[PDB]
Design a binder for this molecule. Structure first.
Ligand SMILES: O[C@@H]1[C@@H](O)[C@H](O)OC[C@H]1O
Ligand SMILES: O[C@@H]1[C@@H](O)[C@H](O)OC[C@H]1O
Ligand SMILES: O[C@@H]1[C@@H](O)[C@H](O)OC[C@H]1O
Ligand SMILES: O[C@@H]1[C@@H](O)[C@H](O)OC[C@H]1O
Ligand SMILES: [Ca+2]
Ligand SMILES: [Ca+2]
Ligand SMILES: [Ca+2]
Ligand SMILES: [Cl-]
Ligand SMILES: [Cl-]
Ligand SMILES: [Cl-]
Ligand SMILES: [Cl-]
Ligand SMILES: [Zn+2]
Ligand SMILES: [Zn+2]
Ligand SMILES: [Zn+2]
Ligand SMILES: [Zn+2]
Ligand SMILES: [Zn+2]
Ligand SMILES: [Zn+2]
Ligand SMILES: [Zn+2]
Length: 316
């Protein structure tokens, strides 16, 4: 809508106060004019019709319980935009400042969130398995990163390519979480998963086997469920990424950690320059090694650590 750019205030899903960019025209709308072609957040009103109504508020204060998922969808879309622009010089998910549109209160008791090809969609959870999923910055950024992947490599969402697709989204979801300093960690979805259980998450990048996911190529899932194990076998790549950043010794292979910024630069270059729709784990290793070579030189520690990490998870 046309109006005046304003700054409102509210609380997110976890009860934390934050400022949000809004637009005033009779009502205050969740329309952020400060980022690209805009960030727009919508009320799906417990239906499955999308996008729903652009979120309108009478007083620019967003402290109602019903407001909280919208506050976080809107705010964390902005954080994700800032990460890709400031760290990778990428303008929105398509690199052309596409508007980022999000709908909250999708369906009833819906334990999921997704990028649908043109917008983000967030369920509210059933209150036992999940609370509203936009409360997790890593969820928001994980799903927006699927759009980045779609507009670049086009990784196919099955088998090894699909596991790489998932891992890329976990990697950048986590790097966004660290960028925001929003209680960062190397687990996924901890802020919105199982409110009655502390210390858990959907999966761990630092220790995938904590939840039974494989941390070595020899332990990969080879069946047909989950599109060939895309959320299971992602642990193999997630652990390699963790090792590249933080270092460690894994299955007897020592990895010299090079930090989060260099992890992000190596994988972003691999994703945008070298991966293809059917890249497998071995081809991802090659893309990461070449990316680190481009950035840091063939004799660099960074290249050596990429090789160590993929060795440690059994990917040649
Ligand atoms: O923490 C990371 C920071 O060090 C880097 O500069 O940008 C990405 C963040 O995840
Ligand atoms: O278990 C890991 C711990 O050893 C390290 O200190 O920080 C990250 C954790 O995942
Ligand atoms: O081949 C071994 C692999 O199967 C195991 O999982 O990790 C150590 C490797 O040496
Ligand atoms: O069966 C597939 C397996 O062959 C591959 O190695 O990893 C993904 C699986 O879906
Ligand atoms: Ca209000
Ligand atoms: Ca996390
Ligand atoms: Ca929990
Ligand atoms: Cl470990
Ligand atoms: Cl381990
Ligand atoms: Cl480790
Ligand atoms: Cl180990
Ligand atoms: Zn998802
Ligand atoms: Zn995903
Ligand atoms: Zn966290
Ligand atoms: Zn799955
Ligand atoms: Zn998923
Ligand atoms: Zn280990
Ligand atoms: Zn380890």
């Amino acid at each position: 809508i046309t109006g005046t750019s304003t700054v409102g205030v509210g609380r997110g899903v976890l009860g934390d106060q934050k400022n949000i960019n809004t637009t005033y025209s009779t009502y205050y709308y969740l329309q952020d004019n400060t980022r690209g072609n805009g960030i727009f957040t919508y009320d799906a009103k417990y239906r499955t019709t999308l996008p729903g109504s652009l979120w309108a508020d009478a007083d620019n204060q967003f402290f109602a319980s019903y407001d909280a998922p919208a506050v976080d969808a809107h705010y964390y879309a902005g954080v994700t935009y800032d990460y890709y622009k400031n760290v990778h010089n990428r303008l929105s998910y398509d690199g052309n400042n596409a508007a980022i549109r999000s709908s909250v209160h999708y369906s009833q008791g819906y334990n999921n969130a997704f990028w649908n090809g043109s917008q983000m969609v967030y369920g509210d959870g059933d209150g036992q398995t999940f609370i509203p999923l936009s409360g997790g910055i890593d969820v928001v950024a994980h799903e927006l990163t699927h759009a980045v992947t779609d507009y670049t490599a086009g990784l196919i969402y099955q088998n090894e390519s699909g596991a790489i697709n998932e891992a890329i989204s976990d990697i950048f979801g986590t790097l966004v979480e660290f960028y925001a300093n929003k209680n960062p960690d190397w687990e996924i979805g901890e802020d919105v998963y199982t409110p009655g259980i502390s210390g858990d998450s959907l999966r761990s990048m630092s220790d995938p086997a904590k939840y039974g996911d494989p941390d070595h190529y020899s332990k990969r899932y080879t069946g047909t469920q989950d599109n060939g194990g895309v959320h299971i076998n992602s642990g193999i790549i997630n652990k390699a990424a963790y090792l590249i950043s933080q270092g460690g010794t894994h299955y007897g292979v020592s990895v010299v950690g090079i930090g989060r910024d260099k992890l992000g630069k190596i994988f972003y270059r691999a994703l945008t320059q070298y991966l293809t729709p059917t890249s497998n784990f071995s081809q991802l290793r090659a893309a990461a090694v070449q990316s680190a070579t481009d950035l840091y030189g063939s004799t660099s520690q960074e290249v050596a650590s990429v090789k160590q990490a993929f060795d440690a998870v059994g990917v040649k």
